[PDB]
């Protein structure tokens, strides 16, 4: 359960990302594909080379879904219903992978927001990304 202080921490941290959200998205994906190569099995149709337009483009989409989640933090299941449907019924990504993307997003935020990535904020973001993952895998079966 996200607390009021968690919600505040995430909104704050995500606020500074602001216009860079898309770049951070792409960066998190690149870090996942390199660090956890099994995640590439879900993107056989992508050019995964560094600098790929596919990865950039997809990074933006992920980052925008995350902005939407932050904006609707009190009502995530509703704001992400369509995405949950998609991952559960069409894409069918094994649930273990969400933890891997979550970790890479955290590393990306840490590398870009040294002032904002305090221990309390790190904790809230970790919980937030876990909550997002739960919502996205809630309709699998």
């Amino acid at each position: 359960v996200l607390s009021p202080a968690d919600k505040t921490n995430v909104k704050a941290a995500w606020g500074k990302v602001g216009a860079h959200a898309g770049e951070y998205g792409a960066e998190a994906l690149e870090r996942m594909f390199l660090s956890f190569p099994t995640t590439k099995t879900y993107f056989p149709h992508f050019d995964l080379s560094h600098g790929s337009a596919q990865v950039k483009g997809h990074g933006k989409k992920v980052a925008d879904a995350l902005t939407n989640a932050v904006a609707h933090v009190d009502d995530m299941p509703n704001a992400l219903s369509a995405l949950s449907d998609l991952h559960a019924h069409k894409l069918r990504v094994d649930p273990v992978n969400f933890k891997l993307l979550s970790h890479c997003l955290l590393v990306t935020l840490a590398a870009h927001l040294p002032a904002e990535f305090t221990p309390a904020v790190h904790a809230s973001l970790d919980k937030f990304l876990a909550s997002v993952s739960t919502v996205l895998t809630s309709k699998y079966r």
């Binding site: 190569p37 099994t38 099995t41 069918r92 990504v93 094994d94 699998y140 079966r141």
Partner: protein
């Protein structure tokens, strides 16, 4: 793979009682029913809409036999799982695009099926040995991923 002699004998002892045909079909089928997202790799197999459609699907059953035939062969080369499964590892990665977590899920479902068929005979020590073996096979199949 830390398999002790007694672990190895127990694995082989039981494996000689298995109707690999039947068991392969039950394990693959159960995987598709219990963890339905694994159905994403088998759309060409036709109807997988209900438990009966999956469990009795002739293509599921025939594929399961193939899977278990490869597994048995692994059981005859427990000291070299990596070499034994190298070509299959490459195939599942490079051509089939299968997340190796799927190998872990199948292994655990295989353990339930063996329990179901052997009842008491599948004692805790025997289960413990089979857990090591299914993790070793899964790891061998994942080893050529890149």
């Amino acid at each position: 793979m830390h398999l002790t002699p007694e672990e190895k004998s127990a694995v082989t002892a039981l494996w000689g009682k298995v109707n690999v045909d039947e068991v392969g079909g039950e394990a693959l089928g159960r995987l598709l029913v219990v963890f339905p997202w694994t159905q994403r790799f088998f759309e060409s197999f036709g109807d997988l809409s209900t438990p009966d459609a999956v469990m009795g699907n002739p293509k599921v059953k025939a594929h399961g036999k193939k899977v278990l035939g490869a597994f048995s062969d692994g059981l005859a080369h427990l000291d070299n799982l990596k070499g034994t499964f190298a070509t299959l590892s490459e195939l599942h990665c490079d051509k089939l695009h299968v997340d190796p977590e799927n190998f872990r899920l199948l292994g655990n479902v295989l353990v339930c099926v063996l329990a179901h068929h052997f009842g008491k005979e599948f004692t805790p020590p025997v289960q413990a040995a089979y857990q090591k073996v299914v993790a070793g096979v899964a790891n061998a199949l994942a080893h050529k991923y890149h």
